[PDB]
Amino acid sequence: MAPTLSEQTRQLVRASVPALQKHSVAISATMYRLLFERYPETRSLFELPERVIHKLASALLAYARSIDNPSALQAAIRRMVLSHARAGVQAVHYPLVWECLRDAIKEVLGPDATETLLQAWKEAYDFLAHLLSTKEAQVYAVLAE
Amino acid sequence: TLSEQTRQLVRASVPALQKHSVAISATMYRLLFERYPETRSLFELPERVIHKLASALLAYARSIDNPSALQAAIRRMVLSHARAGVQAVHYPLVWECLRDAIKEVLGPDATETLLQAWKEAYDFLAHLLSTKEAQVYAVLAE
Ligand code: HEM
Ligand code: HEM
Ligand SMILES: [Cu+2]
Ligand SMILES: [Cu+2]
């Protein structure tokens, strides 16, 4: 549960909320298409890919709106954990989805996807990823026995 | 564990479930909708879940003699229940609706010894599900 959210990360993530209000669906859909074509093993995980795309778009927006208080997203984090565990999402998938999410941001935001903004979102992603993946491992261990 | 008599009756129910499980599951959802409106919050995709429960009833009866072939399906049920917020106190409510759906779909075949066998079979599965959901709930608190 180690990683953290620096002051600069929070400021830049907070500032992208206007772009996410307009483009989070484009970012989420583009992210999933890059994942579909770069890592075909993962397509077996998505029962309803269209529905998940709009859920992730909302989560990105909500997460950016609450980057100063991540604990206010406890219920939504719970949903993500149990959805992932239901589908068999694994710890090693998280680098792949970041790779596709980085390039989704680079594509949709065009010039506004500066390297500082991408580094802020990488840290915000790594925080959320480390929290989701560790709680999922715990849930897996409980259902094994 | 389940008595020999209720396992013979669950086995005898497989023909009814291969033809009517959808009707039983749909009627059971429609009854739950009208009798306990607080639960409608829990269902995001009611149509899809009706068909998933129908297939789970059929699979449960078809392997009533070793519920371990349902290990993957039980996992899915447990994680979907946790994700939706299903509680131990909900299981009596869905039994009353499943019993009345069996009564309605099986008609005269839904005698009281058949319904008693399904009460025992449901209670076994509900116990297995709800205890695993409590363990999952406890870890989400950490
Ligand atoms: C920080 C990283 C991630 C975030 C923020 C995120 C976000 C979400 C959200 C909000 C949902 C919908 C949950 C719901 O409300 O039902 C979801 C579901 C899903 N995600 Fe992700 N996710 C992440 C990582 C991943 C990874 C690494 C994979 C690997 C393939 C993945 C694949 C899936 C699948 C298959 C589902 C649907 C599972 C189900 O509904 O049963 N996600 N995710
Ligand atoms: C022995 C009892 C039960 C059985 C056999 C059963 C069966 C199932 C199955 C097969 C699913 C879908 C699994 C999947 O998503 O792949 C499901 C989900 C669900 N069940 Fe039940 N269930 C039981 C008890 C209950 C109870 C008591 C409630 C209380 C309202 C309930 C409400 C729900 C809801 C809301 C979902 C959807 C969860 C989601 O989609 O995230 N279930 N159940
Ligand atoms: Cu769409
Ligand atoms: Cu139907």
Q: Give the per-residue SS3 of chain A.
A: CCCCCCHHHHHHHHHCHHHHHHHHHHHHHHHHHHHHHHCHHHHHHCCCHHHHHHHHHHHHHHHHHCCCCHHHHHHHHHHHHHHHHHHCCCHHHHHHHHHHHHHHHHHHHHHHCCHHHHHHHHHHHHHHHHHHHHHHHHHHHHHHC
What CATH number did the domain enclosing A38 receive? Answer: 1.10.490.10
**Looking at CA atoms only, how far is residue B71 from chain A in angstroms?**
10
Q: How far apart are CA A112 and CA A106, in angstroms?
A: 8
Q: What is the C-alpha to C-alpha distance for residues A77 and B98, in angstroms, rounded to an integer?
A: 32
- To the query of whether residue A94 is one of the catalytic residues in this protein, the response is yes
> Could you tell me the distance, in angstroms and rounded to a whole number, from the CA of residue B81 to the centre of ligand 1?
17
> A83 in ligand 1 pocket by Cβ < 6 Å?
yes
CA B48–ligand 4 middle distance (angstroms)? 7
Q: What is the resolution of this structure in A?
A: 2.5
Could you tell me the sign of the dihedral formed by the alpha carbons of B128, B134, B138, B141, in that order?
A: positive
Distance of alpha carbon B62 from alpha carbon B58, whole angstroms: 6
- Give the span between the Cα atoms of A48 and A54, in whole angstroms: 11
* Cα separations in angstroms, A116 against A11, A101, A121: 11, 15, 9
What angle do the packed helices B91-106 and B4-35 form, to 10 degrees?
100
Cα of A108 to nearest chain B Cα, Å: 30
What is the Cα–Cα distance from B3 to A7, expressed in whole angstroms?
Answer: 63
CA distances from B93 to A123, B10, B99, B122 (A): 45, 21, 10, 12
Helices then strands, each counted (H, E), chain B: 5, 0
The number of domains in chain B is 1
Q: Do B140 and A85 touch (CB under 8 A)?
A: no
Q: Which residues of chain B have a CB within 8 Å of the CB of A135?
A: 139-140, 142
Gap between the Cα atoms of B125 and B1, Å rounded: 10
Cα–Cα distance list, A56 to A59, A109, B24 (Å): 5, 17, 35
In whole angstroms, give the CA distance from residue B25 to residue B46.
11
- Residue-number span of the structural domain to which A113 is assigned: 1-145
Q: Which of B15, B3, B23 is nearest to B65 (CA)?
A: B3
B70 alpha carbon, distance to own chain's centre: 13
Q: What angle do CA A17, A18, A24 make, to 5 degrees?
A: 70
CB of B73 within 8 A of CB of B79?
no
Tell whether the torsion through CA atoms of B29, B34, B40 and B46 is positive or negative. Answer: positive
